[PDB]
Symmetry: C3
């Protein structure tokens, strides 16, 4: 049995979000299982982002790399802040947690905040954890990319 | 003996604040002992909120429900972020902790931040924890309701 | 052997930052080894702060005390929020960690945010932990003092 606790899960969440903040896009993608679903719903009061597997995320990372390859200073500096992590369930080595988050983002003169809640299912059966499903609720919805969430 | 550690306390703090963010007002009230004191002092440089028992909080929740029962979209979305949790004392099954917090709030176009420190005494003697005392220092004091703190 | 885990490190980080938020300047200085190096680099796209030992920090605390000794209300209220703490290495009783942070600051009408990442090396060999090295990356760099970071 793999014994996985909240601290193990938090360590993974901190690493995953660090890989975005540090623009380590390939390492970041490797935190996701090839069959990972990634879903940020719209508020109907149609998703903001939906990918049924990781390929969609790979393509989006390709777009980000392409945009950045021409781009000059100032860059966008981001800082993820993962809070209030609660374990919801475990099914074998697949662990489901929810958490609140607040990403601060800065380029040049202006700071932007994005905040909300996320639910992750994470497969700990391999030597490195792998996200099986990501669900993101953006609360300040009225652009946003994957490196903000 | 109930052995209660910081993680158990954090789990409770995350749940309590989640019940506000998710507008689960009755479940939220049940995190508080009937004799709970709830105090957010004013800065004299008279409280912003004071209740000597839970009844005052029940009445305030009634007011919130009444306001919401007519209200249309956009709603106010809140996100609590509990940080820097330190245990201060334990007396039997009553555990006292302090922590910093930052609630982000959004309706329509504008994000609001509230931040400060809180001290909780929490009774873990029952099957579910119960807040015995809540003290809240709002640092950006110059409105605010119970779902922001 | 001193067994030190992430929770022990977090407890220390929370205390150290609390001593700044509560303006306990002498107690704060005592979280730092006399030979502590404190470095907040500039972005070259020359540091914002560099001290090769604690004396520089002592002198800066003296300046802060002098400024405050004449100053009237409203004061500046600060609130540190330490997030995403990851242990990087241990060498004997010296433990190195990185973390993200967001300090909120308020005086009078306006809230200011400072955010970024920090790396600490902390010596746990004595009865009280002592910072041996502090490195701070301020992401929203375009004033700031030691009580903001």
């Amino acid at each position: 049995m793999k014994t996985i606790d909240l601290a193990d899960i938090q360590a993974f969440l901190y690493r995953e979000s660090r890989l975005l903040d540090d623009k380590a896009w390939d390492a970041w993608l490797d935190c996701y299982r090839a069959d990972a679903v990634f879903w940020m719903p719209s508020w109907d009061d149609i998703s903001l982002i939906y990918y049924p597997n990781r390929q969609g995320l790979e393509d989006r990372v390709f777009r980000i790399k392409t945009e950045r390859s021409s781009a000059t200073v100032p860059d966008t500096r981001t800082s993820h802040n993962i809070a209030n992590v609660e374990r919801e369930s475990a099914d074998g080595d697949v662990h489901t947690v929810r958490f609140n988050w607040h990403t601060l983002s800065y380029r040049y003169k202006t700071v932007s905040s994005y905040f909300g809640m996320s639910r992750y299912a994470i497969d700990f059966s391999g030597d490195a954890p792998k996200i099986v499903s990501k669900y993101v609720v953006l609360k300040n919805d009225y652009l946003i990319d994957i490196y903000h969430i």
